[PDB]
């Protein structure tokens, strides 16, 4: 509720009014402090969601994502204070302002009690990210990249706007509790499909499914490090949160209309993971891997099965923490080599031995190696999907088989092998990069002991 | 460059015997068959028709490409062998050692002092050895990858650093 919001927004005057060089320090202090307070919100009751007021409420689904976003907030500050050191204090302050303003919106939307209120800051997250990708992005095609990312989501979000207000004029309020209790069987009338399509496509776009995913490779690669993590670790997941919330009034229409997306997602994950097997760009390879994992959640959410929701929430968080880490891996390597081609800097393990380890559990976590939370996600989803149909395991398991090859492919090409002779600027890794990397992996294994925290309201 | 015929025959002679060794295995057979294999080689040494010599080496390796042992014998250190770049993962470039923390550098004072001499030597030698390069570079770029030595006294041969300071083949 408020105990998270005002501390987040009151953090903004601090960064603006802090000393010239202390900006990174005091921002990091209370961002971690905010994370601690958010963790206090992680508690949930049995069945009734933790409701605070007409404006804000939390459930067993929102809380794990809330603590994840606040937990993220220190990490971009940690990950960004290397390529922004040679910048004017105002621009550094502006950069920090963008992140916490972005993070502030995330707390708002996840705790939003009204769908329209959920909707207003659903796209409002775009404005800070658009600035981050465009201004501080370090590339040339970032301009076209920002346009692709911006227009795709709007093209899907605006139908939701017309759909959402239609609910208000037809079924009174759009309070999440009032929708759930007063749910009615959506008919099969040919208007209700376009009703169904509008209420779904908005979350489809910013949850890249095959076909509606070309923004993500352009979104991730040209975005700066902080932009890439926030976009891949939370931003691809507003779509996820919407579906678990909005599919309450899409049944039984979801039963019949689910087919085109399920085939698109299940086949897409094989295709996308195949792209990972032959990606020339390390950041792009990680980006395409996010599509495969996210497309798995598409099948998870859209099956509408108790087990499927549970594994979704497991992959909901685990992928986000993992994808942020892998982007950190690529970023921590990038500036040393000043290039994105994977084969540019081979045999890094012989030069940097600890990064060899950090890359190693990172690849293992993305492998869904048990008992990592990723395995709990994928394995739960497979069982739910298998109950839905026996055939899907052929597609399901094949993804894990492909996921194995490309995951260690980056490991062998970069970490193992012969070091590149020509390069000589690879310095011993700063303990900031090392500290940040453990900041990611350590909570992941810490979460393994308590899956019930992140299983969700279906748990 | 020009893979002239005599080197090809020597290529044929050397590699075929290695394959023949992989076949006979036993030393007496290997020695016995090598001599007859040798004997059938030098007996046709009088051919003013080099084209005929080429024709004699059409069926030559074709029989070899049939007669080749599917698992030839290679010492492990060579390509394909079991110990191929086995100790590569240990060898690390010397320039990475410049990164070493001063306390680590203090652990090896005199050797690091010797590094300073090498760093000093390679500095002025570079300009000297590069200067020798342009003044004797053949026109139209380098024609052969072979690198000319240090003509005058005192100066080191050009581009000597990486070859000389190459990590040893058994680094541990």
């Amino acid at each position: 509720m408020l105990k998270i919001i005002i501390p987040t927004t009151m953090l903004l005057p601090m960064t603006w009014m802090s000393k010239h060089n202390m900006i990174w320090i005091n921002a990091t202090v209370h961002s971690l402090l905010i994370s601690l307070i958010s963790l206090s919100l992680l508690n949930q009751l049995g069945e009734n969601s933790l409701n605070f007021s007409l404006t804000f409420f939390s459930d067993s689904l929102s809380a794990p994502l809330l603590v994840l976003t606040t937990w993220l907030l220190p990490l971009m500050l940690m990950a960004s204070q290397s390529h922004l050191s040679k910048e004017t204090t105002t621009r550094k302050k502006l950069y920090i302002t963008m992140l916490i303003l972005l993070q502030l919106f995330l707390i708002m939307t996840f705790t939003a009690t009204e769908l329209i209120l959920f909707y207003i800051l659903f796209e409002a997250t775009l404005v800070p990210t658009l600035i981050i990708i465009t201004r501080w992005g370090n590339q040339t095609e970032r301009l076209n990249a920002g346009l692709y990312f911006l227009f795709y989501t709007l093209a899907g979000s605006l139908p939701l706007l017309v759909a959402l207000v239609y609910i208000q004029n037809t079924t009174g309020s759009l309070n999440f509790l009032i929708i759930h209790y007063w749910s009615h069987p959506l008919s099969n009338s040919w208007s209700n499909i376009f009703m169904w399509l509008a209420c779904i496509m908005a979350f489809m776009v910013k949850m890249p499914l095959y076909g509606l995913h070309l923004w993500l490779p352009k979104a991730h690669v040209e975005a700066p490090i902080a932009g890439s993590m926030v976009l891949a670790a939370v931003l691809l997941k507003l779509g996820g949160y919407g579906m678990m919330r909005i599919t309450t009034i899409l049944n039984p229409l979801t039963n019949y209309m689910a087919y085109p997306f399920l085939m698109l997602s299940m086949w897409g994950m094989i295709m996308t993971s195949s792209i990972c097997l032959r990606q020339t760009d390390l950041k792009s390879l990680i980006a395409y891997s996010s599509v495969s994992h996210m497309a798995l959640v598409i099948v998870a959410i859209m099956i509408q099965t108790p087990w499927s929701f549970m594994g979704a929430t497991a992959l909901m968080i685990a992928h986000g923490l993992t994808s942020s880490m892998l982007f950190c891996l690529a970023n921590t390597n990038y500036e040393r080599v000043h290039s994105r081609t994977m084969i540019l800097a081979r045999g890094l393990q012989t030069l940097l031995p600890l990064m060899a380890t950090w890359w190693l559990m990172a690849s293992l976590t993305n492998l869904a190696l048990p008992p990592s939370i990723n395995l709990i996600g994928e394995l739960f989803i497979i069982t739910a999907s298998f109950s839905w149909s026996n055939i899907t395991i052929i597609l399901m398991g094949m993804n894990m088989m492909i996921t194995a090859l490309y995951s260690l492919y980056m490991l062998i090409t970069t970490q193992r092998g012969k070091y590149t002779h020509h390069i000589n600027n690879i310095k011993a890794s700063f303990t900031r990069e090392n500290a940040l990397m453990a900041l990611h992996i350590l909570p992941l294994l810490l979460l393994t002991l308590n899956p019930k925290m992140i299983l969700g309201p279906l748990y | 460059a020009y893979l002239t015929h005599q080197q090809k025959v020597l290529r044929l002679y050397k590699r075929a015997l290695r394959h023949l060794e992989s076949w006979c295995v036993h030393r007496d057979k290997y020695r016995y068959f090598a001599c007859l294999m040798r004997a059938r080689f030098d007996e046709h040494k009088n051919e003013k028709d080099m084209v005929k010599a080429t024709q004699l080496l059409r069926q030559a390796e074709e029989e070899f490409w049939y007669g080749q042992h599917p698992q030839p014998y290679i010492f492990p250190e060579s390509p394909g062998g079991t110990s191929y770049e086995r100790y590569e993962c240990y060898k690390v470039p010397e320039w990475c050692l410049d990164d070493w923390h001063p306390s680590e550098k203090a652990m090896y004072p005199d050797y690091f002092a010797k590094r300073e001499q090498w760093k000093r030597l390679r500095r002025e030698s570079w300009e000297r050895e590069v200067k020798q390069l342009q003044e004797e570079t053949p026109p139209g770029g380098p024609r052969t990858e072979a690198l000319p030595p240090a003509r005058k006294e005192g100066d080191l041969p050009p581009l000597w650093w990486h070859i000389v300071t190459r990590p040893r083949e058994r680094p541990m």
């Binding site: 031995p353 011993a428 | 010397e94 070493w100 306390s103």
Partner: peptide
């Protein structure tokens, strides 16, 4: 004998 072994700095 005994000769110097090269190794990346593990101090950090």
């Amino acid at each position: 004998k005994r000769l110097f072994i090269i190794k990346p700095s593990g101090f950090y």
